[PDB]
Design a protein around this ligand. Structure first.
Ligand SMILES: *[B]([O])([O])[C]([C][C]([C])[C])[N]C(=O)[C]([C]C1=[C][C]=[C][C]=[C]1)[N]C(=O)C1=[C]N=[C][C]=N1
Ligand SMILES: *[B]([O])([O])[C]([C][C]([C])[C])[N]C(=O)[C]([C]C1=[C][C]=[C][C]=[C]1)[N]C(=O)C1=[C]N=[C][C]=N1
Lengths: 196, 204, 233, 244, 243, 250, 222, 244
């Protein structure tokens, strides 16, 4: 699995590969690892499909009840709920989650929640088995306040490299753009990113 | 080690023309040591017959349980439970202990009193129902039984013929299993009557 | 009226009173007088012990919570034991978990909350005892008055029990005087005895009838009875 | 608080009586009369259905005679619904006993148990007692045919012939008048019908207002047989006994 | 004996006085409300009265946003209304979690009616002195209005009204539908339906409304929202230019 | 908090009466009349949809409910009590029977379960009896067609025909006259419609009346095909139209 | 085991083989791996027989009760949420691997659930030991916009890939078609390509061949 | 009949709950306290009757903080007030722990509301004997609230409760009218000290001690703090001056 979230000038974009495996067998080649826990708060799932799905469904339930009572939640709040679940249940979960959301006052934000259950707010974040192969690339090519086009390109190149080296990653690259303008879904096929 | 190989034993059931048959061996041992040669594995509640192979203590417990349940059933329903219904009761009862099962291999046989249709069924230790039209096998010599049945069997046999068939299937399978044998009993069931015969077999 | 609203604490009267609580307060008045006063270095508790017969003892009215805290009681002894024991634990939890002595003001808060729970729920009864708590903490000497209603107040001096109003007036008068008895415990204790005698009438404070407690700057809360208090009679 | 609305169902009267038990009994006394008569070759249970109609389906009806075991049965007088709760637990205690000892439960053991349940609602729990009285008719290989009775108090006793429900005093006097130790099941049947026939609060005594049952050990067998009479069967026995 | 009027047990006449008295409580706020169904929206109008000058007018409401799609207006004391709201929100959130789709207006109504039916049968729970009107544009039933009471009763309406002067509003609305012969305001925009609603709210009550005398909630496909003082004014003006 | 009402709210009076059950029956008496008639090949249960306002949608309120594909219920008394009883009845039919024997319970047993729930609300601590009387009709392979009545006490009995609620006495009488053991289902429906007419004050049509039957299997109401032993539910609610078509031959 | 699911232009279809095994022994030559959750929501199960049957009936039961309570047709996403949260609760110990499909007020659906509780969505799916033979066929013949008949063929051929090439799968082919506006149609043994050839001889024994020691009549009646 | 006022969750025939109304009497019998919302915060103040000279001055504090941004003051049964703050403090910790962000004042208000309303649902508990004024600064502004024993609460521009609630409410209504642009933190502090000195006349017999606290986005950084020393004295003066 290769997933990442990057904050740029207009907000934030989430990207992921679409492969779920059972050993060396690709159980699902068109997986959607970019999950919505709120209108403008999405997450990136890595690790156990069952664990992350269950976690995501719970956070969604929580934010929906939060909204019903106190209105739209901050991205920081969504990360707090994910963390609370991941940390308190560290012994029975295998979930690497990246939380990205778009706020009007805060623009775009990214919080990464790795295995332990610790929280980390960053300009951008990468996770999943394939992320190890692009640590160098991403660190060398990331700049703050990029444009949507620059960002989509950064995610597209980074992930195609991750997909190239990591056998657990593959299929199509999916993206989700979060800005004041709204929500946009992007999809890139093999024939495109494989030759970048 | 294997709760299903400590006591030993077999049960087999077949459907014939307007009849059904169910048989079992009589051995009850403790590993190599034979202990009893009168341990029957076939019981009945009303006109529904049930054979149980596996760990003897559970075979006994389950029988006591189904007597208990079919009794209350008759008192409330004001009628005798039918093969089909019982099968379901056995299945749900077994799954109730899904993670601490009874080490048994149940077999149901009987004639539906209303439709007069012959019926047989097998179950694994957690309740999975196997409703076959020809035969069901269970026990420590189930491979042998499968072999005997798959060859010897044929549809619509008459009571007298079905008897010869099921008896030969049981007898020859048991003689290839160290944990089975020591006597056998066969039940030929018909809408109206039920005959029980003890077979003559090797005692080693 | 009242008779239909004093059945239990969970019931409010038409005027907004809680009679059961008021009745509890009444147990205090029927209790033997006790006094409390402090300077800036010490805090003293002078308690008049009451005896049943002349063959009986003069029941203890002073309990120690910690090395820096203690209190005098007026009312139902069992309730004072329950409340004092609770305070001993809070004083103790503070030392064990935080290696910190519990602030007198904070102990008052705890008693108030414990008392309150017994005035809002069905089946229970309010506590029937008044308490005067003295202590020396990180902010000096302190004196507190506890009422079963849950009201706890910090004062320079005060008294509770029968005829307690005598002493209370005396103190409210002698204020400017004893508040300055710093560095001199015996003078504070004497002032404490002259206050408690302003509520006498029946007899006169005797040796086995008098009980005094002191705490302060360099004085771990300690209790004196009999002979040890002879030099104050 | 709640205390205010607590009836305190389990307290003693100044005379040392149990209010609720007393009133439950008063309740039972208005219930259709049930009679149990024990012979030498069997037992007879008869009961009068309280309140009936032209449209009441009697064929599928049961309100006073229930089978507990294959050797034990009961006649009910009181709240049917309350009775069913007890009957079901009763049927369970029987099966438990059977599964534990592999022997049918002795009649008294089953009766003592149920009576114990009732007695409980009498001493603790703050709940009302069961408005029910039972006549137990059963057989076991230790005491043969037995006849018992239990009421809201949780007390029970054995009889040769007895009644529960309405007009018990009247019915008891009549039984204590024509009963004889050497009776026969057919004699008992007739005595039972006569008693009800004389204590009814209705016009005549028709079959549509009766429930009948016998526990005999049919000579041509050697086992005990319970027979809950069918409407037609009760109508017949009604004619023969000269009540048409 | 006479306690058959303090807790919820039957009176000799087979009545439950506590339920009846709870109904009385529903009018304590002296406010009226009504709901009508559009072609593809549902509207709820409710009187807004702010007596104290020391109050923050923006926090005086009896309309609630139960879920992205369910809206609820309450007739009764605010503390009981908020208790009912919090619960309904919780119930709606959980339903989505467990069943994978949004709780339908009619279903949440039933759920709350059942909860109310319980305070009716259990002695330790008092009924809530409120009437709840739920509205939305159900994905299967379209514009929907369901109302529940302290008796645990609930039913769906073509249009409805609640409050002290409920009868006048009702008969007014009744007359309109006897006429139009349809069971809904045949309007494409919710703005006109809101206007229809306020108009009749005025006829039946014989009163004129300023932008701060009303409170309005609108339910449309996938969303329920409440109008602002200014959104309402824009509404009031429009109606003015017709009379 | 915490229900501290652990004592019975229904107790025995000196006369031997159980006040709360008596009062509950009184509540039932005020209820809208409902009835049931058993034919030789079916059963019919019917009641009046007493709309509590013309602005209310009478459809959204069904007094006749399906408990199992071969069993239905109807009542008289407190609708909310009936509603929660139907939910429990449907669930108990599963938890206590289908999930065990893999088949729906027979009418008498389900009725028995319901009766139990009601009996408990007669003795448990902190509750009042249910203020309803139900008429349950169903069919099962070994018992055929049946009709029962369950009262607030928890008592129940089988009927050839009966009525409960407001004008039960008059209705019961009219039924005794028209009932016989050779009635066909249509005949019973007809008699049901006639009986209910004497009880309805205002409009009498397929929109003010609610009627359902327990008859033949409806393979068309099954939703799928392929399993020979599944022929469809015997429970069927009549349509507003189906009712009117019959009211014309009234 | 081989179970598959295939969406077509106006519905969804699911198929499965009919073999059950214990080690290398065929326990059942014609079991039914197709379960009904509600009239129009069917499920294909693989893994532990008792488990697939049990979880399928439990959710089915609750779905029925939920339907009655809401006066609405059951939705596939609801069966999917109840099933998945149940399986998740049991950390994989309930060996149920399901392909759940169906039509409801919101349209036609196709999902899969693994024992641990994860779900997946697609136009075509397969699970079981035959899963790889089936998927090879699906990845080779599937196309968007299939007709009901094309779907039946595709799904049926996928199961056959399992029957022939996977030892864990065999015997017959079961299918169930769920179309948007019609009744769901269950086709038990839609294909039976493995009929046993006539035996070479009859083993009917001459009566009396079996030695009997004792005999008696059994009492059924009570 | 009557008795409708002896049990807490009971509805009187007129739909009221007398026990709650009685609790209110307890609130009216208490010290007066207020709340003044300003352009970027809120100010709290309360009257502290000096029963005697023995009371250590400035010690027995009454105003309470919840979390770090909320202030609470109340009139009525003091212990009941602490009980409510304790709950609020737990309520707040819980919220921050899961959502990270300190609790919004509106959210906090409902927490207290739901809890207080809860104590009017059972006869096993008593309604709260206090009216609480509380508020603070949050993500979107300042908020002032007053909660009644019935669980009722609304947002206010200014609020008062206790003995002299009328004097205060009067003074508060003036300020509201003569300052549509909104008072200031600094100004509200003096204004408050005044409303308190005026409302003290409804208790002019006993001497008192003033207490003020405030939470202003600019003066305290959104944190709740007590007014002490100079700023306090300056306010006492502004009051002592205009009291003549
Ligand atoms: B990715 O690696 O995170 C990937 C996708 C998932 C987060 C939606 N993980 C998986 O597919 C996991 C195994 C794994 C592989 C490499 C690194 C970490 C974890 N597989 C499954 O969860 C799975 C497989 N088959 C059925 C159900 N679930
Ligand atoms: B298939 O592979 O999924 C198949 C069909 C079943 C899910 C309906 N599986 C089985 O038949 C299983 C395999 C298995 C064996 C041992 C442990 C777990 C799974 N067999 C059985 O479930 C079974 C049931 N009864 C008797 C014998 N075997």
């Amino acid at each position: 699995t290769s997933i990442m979230a990057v904050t740029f000038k207009d907000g934030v974009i989430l990207g992921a590969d679409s492969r779920t495996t059972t050993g060396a067998y690709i159980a699902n080649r068109v997986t959607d690892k970019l999950t919505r826990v709120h209108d403008k708060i999405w997450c990136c799932r890595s690790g156990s499909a069952a664990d992350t799905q269950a976690i995501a469904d719970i956070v969604q339930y929580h934010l929906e009840l939060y909204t019903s009572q106190y209105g739209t939640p901050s991205t920081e709040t969504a990360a707090s709920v994910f963390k609370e679940l991941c940390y308190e249940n560290k012994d029975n979960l295998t979930a690497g989650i990246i939380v990205a959301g778009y706020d009007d006052k805060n623009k775009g934000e990214v919080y990464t929640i790795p295995l332990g259950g610790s929280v980390h707010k960053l300009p951008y974040a990468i996770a999943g088995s394939g992320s190890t192969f692009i640590y160098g690339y991403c660190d060398k090519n990331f700049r703050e306040n990029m444009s949507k086009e620059e960002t989509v390109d950064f995610i597209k190149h980074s992930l195609s490299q991750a997909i190239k080296w990591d056998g657990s990653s593959g299929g199509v690259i999916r993206m989700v753009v979060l800005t004041a303008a709204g929500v946009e879904r992007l999809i890139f096929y093999p024939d495109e990113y494989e030759q970048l | 080690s294997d709760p299903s190989s400590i006591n030993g034993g077999i049960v087999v059931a077949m459907t014939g023309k307007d009849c059904v048959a169910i048989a079992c061996d009589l051995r009850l041992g403790s590993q190599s040591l034979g202990v009893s040669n009168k341990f029957e594995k076939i019981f009945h509640y009303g006109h529904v017959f049930l054979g149980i192979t596996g760990l003897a203590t559970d075979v006994t417990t389950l029988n006591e349980m189904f007597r208990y349940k079919t009794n209350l059933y008759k008192l409330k329903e004001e009628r005798a439970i039918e093969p089909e219904t019982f099968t379901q009761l056995v299945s749900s009862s077994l799954y109730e202990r899904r993670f601490g099962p009874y080490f048994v291999g149940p077999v149901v046989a009987g004639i539906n009193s209303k439709s007069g249709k012959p019926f047989i069924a097998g179950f694994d230790l957690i309740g999975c129902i196997d409703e076959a039209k020809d035969f069901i096998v269970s026990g420590t010599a189930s491979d042998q039984l499968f072999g005997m049945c798959e060859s010897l069997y044929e549809p619509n046999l008459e009571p007298e013929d079905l008897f010869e068939t099921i008896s030969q299937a049981l007898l020859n399978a048991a003689d290839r299993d160290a944990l089975s044998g020591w006597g056998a009993v066969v039940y030929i069931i018909k809408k109206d009557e039920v005959v029980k015969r003890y077979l003559k077999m090797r005692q080693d | 009226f009242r008779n239909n609203y004093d059945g239990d604490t969970v019931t409010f009267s038409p005027t907004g009173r809680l009679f059961q609580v008021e009745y509890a307060l009444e147990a205090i008045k029927q209790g033997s007088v006790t006094v409390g006063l402090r300077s800036n270095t010490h805090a003293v508790l002078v308690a008049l012990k009451r005896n049943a017969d002349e063959l009986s003892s003069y029941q203890k009215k002073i309990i120690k919570c910690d090395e820096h805290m203690g209190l005098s009681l007026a009312g139902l002894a069992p309730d004072a034991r329950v409340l004092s024991n609770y305070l001993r634990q809070q004083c103790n939890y503070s030392s064990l978990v935080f290696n910190r002595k519990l602030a007198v003001e904070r102990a008052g808060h705890l008693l108030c909350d414990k008392a309150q729970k017994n005035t809002q729920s069905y089946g229970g009864r309010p506590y029937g005892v008044g308490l005067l708590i003295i202590g020396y903490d990180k902010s000096g000497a302190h004196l507190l008055e506890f009422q079963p209603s849950g009201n706890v107040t910090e004062l320079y001096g005060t008294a509770i029990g029968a005829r307690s109003q005598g002493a209370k007036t005396y103190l409210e008068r002698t204020l400017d005087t004893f508040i300055k008895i710093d560095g001199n415990p015996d003078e504070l204790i004497k002032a404490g005895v002259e206050a408690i005698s302003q509520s006498l009438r029946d007899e006169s404070l005797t040796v086995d009838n008098l009980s005094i407690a002191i705490v302060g700057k360099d004085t771990p809360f300690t209790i004196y009875d009999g002979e040890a208090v002879a030099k104050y009679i | 608080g709640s205390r205010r609305y607590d009836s305190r169902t389990t307290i003693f009267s100044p005379e040392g009586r149990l209010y609720q038990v007393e009133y439950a009994l008063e309740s039972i006394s208005h219930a259709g009369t049930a009679i149990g008569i024990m012979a030498s070759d069997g037992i007879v249970l008869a009961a009068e259905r309280k309140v009936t109609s032209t449209l009441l389906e009697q064929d599928t009806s049961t309100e006073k005679l229930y089978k507990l075991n294959d050797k034990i049965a009961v006649a009910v007088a009181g709240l049917t619904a309350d009775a069913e709760i007890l009957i079901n637990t009763a049927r369970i205690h029987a099966q438990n006993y059977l599964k534990t000892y592999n022997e049918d439960i002795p009649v008294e053991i089953l009766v003592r148990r149920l009576s114990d349940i009732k007695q409980g609602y009498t001493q603790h729990g703050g709940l009302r007692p069961f408005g029910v009285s039972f006549i137990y008719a059963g057989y076991d290989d230790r005491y043969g045919y037995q006849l018992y009775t239990s009421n809201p108090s949780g007390n029970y006793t054995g009889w040769k012939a007895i009644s529960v429900g309405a007009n018990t005093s009247a019915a008891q006097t009549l039984l204590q008048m024509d009963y004889k130790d050497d009776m026969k099941v057919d004699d008992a049947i007739e005595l039972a019908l006569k008693t009800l026939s004389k204590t009814t609060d209705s016009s005549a005594l028709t079959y549509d207002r009766l429930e009948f049952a016998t526990i005999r050990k049919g000579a041509n067998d050697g086992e005990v047989y319970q027979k809950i009479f069918k409407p037609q069967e009760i109508k017949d026995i009604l004619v023969k006994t000269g009540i048409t | 004996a006479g306690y058959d009027r303090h807790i919820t047990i039957f009176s000799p006449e087979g009545r439950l006085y506590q339920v009846e008295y709870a109904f009385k409580a529903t009018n304590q706020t002296n406010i009226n409300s009504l709901a009508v169904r559009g072609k593809d929206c549902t509207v709820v109008i409710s009187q807004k009265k702010v007596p104290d000058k020391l109050l923050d007018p923006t926090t005086v409401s009896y309309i609630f946003c139960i879920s992205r799609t369910i809206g609820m207006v309450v007739n009764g004391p605010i503390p009981d209304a908020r208790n009912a709201a919090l619960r309904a929100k919780a119930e709606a959130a959980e339903f989505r979690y467990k069943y994978g789709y949004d709780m339908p207006c009619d279903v949440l109504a039933k759920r709350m009616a059942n909860l109310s039916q319980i305070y009716t049968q259990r002695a330790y729970m008092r009924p809530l002195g409120v009437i709840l009107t739920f509205v939305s544009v159900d994905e299967e039933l379209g514009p929907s209005i369901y109302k529940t009471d302290p008796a645990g009763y609930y039913v769906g309406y073509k249009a409805t009204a609640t409050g002290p002067k409920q009868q006048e509003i009702t008969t007014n609305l009744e007359n309109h539908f006897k006429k139009s012969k349809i069971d809904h305001i045949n309007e494409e925009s919710w703005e006109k339906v809101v206007e229809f609603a306020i108009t009749h709210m005025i006829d039946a009550l014989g009163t004129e409304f300023s932008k701060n005398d009303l409170e309005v909630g609108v339910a449309t496909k996938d969303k329920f929202f409440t109008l602002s003082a200014e959104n309402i004014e824009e509404r009031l003006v429009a109606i003015a230019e017709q009379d | 908090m915490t229900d501290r009402y652990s004592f019975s709210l229904t107790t025995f009076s000196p006369s031997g009466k159980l006040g709360q059950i008596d009062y509950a029956l009184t509540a039932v008496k005020q209820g809208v009349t409902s009835l049931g008639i058993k034919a030789t090949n079916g059963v019919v249960i019917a009641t009046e949809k007493k709309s509590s306002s013309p602005l209310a949608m009478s459809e959204t309120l069904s007094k006749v409910s399906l408990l199992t594909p071969d069993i239905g219920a109807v009542y008289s008394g407190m609708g909310p009590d009936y509603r929660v009883l139907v939910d429990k009845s449907r669930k108990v039919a599963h938890t206590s029977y289908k999930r065990i024997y893999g088949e729906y319970p027979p009418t008498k047993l389900l009725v028995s379960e319901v009766a139990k729930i009601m009996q408990e609300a007669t003795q448990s601590g902190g509750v009042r009896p249910f203020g309803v009387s139900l008429l349950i009709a169903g069919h099962d392979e070994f018992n055929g067609f049946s009709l029962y009545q369950v009262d607030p006490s928890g008592s129940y009995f089988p009927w050839k025909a009966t009525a409960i609620g407001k004008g039960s006495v008059a209705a019961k009488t009219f039924l005794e006259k028209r009932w016989n053991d050779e009635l066909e289902l249509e005949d019973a429906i007809h008699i049901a419609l006639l009986t209910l007419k004497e009880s309805v004050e205002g409009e009498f049509n397929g929109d003010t009346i609610e009627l359902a039957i327990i008859g033949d299997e409806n393979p068309d109401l099954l939703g799928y095909t392929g399993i020979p032993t599944d022929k469809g539910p015997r429970f069927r609610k009549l349509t507003s139209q189906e009712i009117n078509d019959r009211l014309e031959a009234l | 085991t081989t179970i598959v699911g295939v969406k077509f232009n106006n519905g969804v279809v699911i198929a499965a083989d009919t073999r059950s095994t214990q080690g290398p022994i065929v326990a059942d030559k014609n079991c039914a791996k197709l379960h009904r959750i509600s009239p129009k929501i069917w499920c294909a199960g693989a893994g532990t027989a008792a488990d697939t049957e049990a979880v399928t009936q439990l959710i089915g039961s609750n779905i029925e009760l939920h339907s009655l309570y809401t006066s609405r047709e059951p939705r596939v996403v609801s069966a999917l949420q109840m099933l998945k949260q149940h399986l998740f609760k049991y950390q994989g110990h309930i060996g149920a691997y399901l392909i759940v499909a169906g039509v409801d007020p919101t349209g036609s659906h196709l999902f899969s659930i693994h024992a641990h509780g994860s779900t997946d969505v697609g136009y075509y799916l397969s699970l079981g030991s035959g899963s790889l033979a089936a998927m090879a066929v699906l990845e080779s013949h599937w196309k968007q916009d299939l007709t009901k008949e094309e779907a039946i063929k595709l799904a049926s051929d996928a199961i056959q890939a399992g029957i022939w090439n996977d030892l864990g799968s065999g015997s017959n082919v079961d299918v169930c078609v769920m179309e948007i506006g019609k009744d769901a149609e269950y086709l038990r043994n839609y294909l039976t390509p493995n009929v046993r050839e006539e035996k070479q001889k009859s083993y009917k024994f001459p009566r009396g061949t079996t030695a009997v020691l004792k005999e008696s009549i059994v009492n059924i009646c009570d | 009949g009557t008795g409708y006022d002896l049990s807490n969750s009971v509805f009187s025939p007129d739909g009221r709950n007398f026990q709650v109304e009685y609790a209110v009497k307890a609130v009216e019998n208490g010290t007066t306290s207020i709340g003044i919302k300003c352009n970027d915060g809120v100010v709290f103040a309360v009257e502290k009757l000096i029963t005697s000279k023995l009371l250590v001055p400035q010690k027995n504090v009454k105003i309470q903080v919840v979390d770090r941004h909320i202030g609470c003051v109340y009139s009525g049964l003091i212990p009941d007030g602490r009980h409510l703050v304790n709950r609020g403090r737990e309520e707040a910790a819980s919220f921050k722990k899961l959502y990270k962000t300190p609790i919004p004042i509106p959210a906090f208000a409902d927490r207290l509301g739901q809890y207080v309303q809860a104590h009017t649902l059972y006869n096993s508990v008593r309604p709260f004997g206090v009216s609480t004024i509380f508020g603070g600064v949050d993500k979107n502004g300042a908020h002032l609230y007053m909660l009644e024993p019935s669980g009722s609460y609304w947002g206010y521009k200014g609020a008062a409760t206790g003995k002299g609630r009328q004097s205060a409410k009067a003074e508060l209504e003036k300020l509201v009218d003569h300052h549509p642009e909104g008072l200031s933190a600094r100004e509200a502090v003096k204004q408050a000290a005044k409303i308190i000195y005026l409302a003290h006349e409804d208790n002019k017999e006993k001497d008192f001690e003033l207490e003020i606290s405030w939470c202003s986005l600019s003066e305290t950084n959104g944190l709740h703090k007590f007014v002490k020393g100079d700023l306090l004295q300056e306010a006492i003066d502004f009051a002592q001056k205009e009291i003549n």
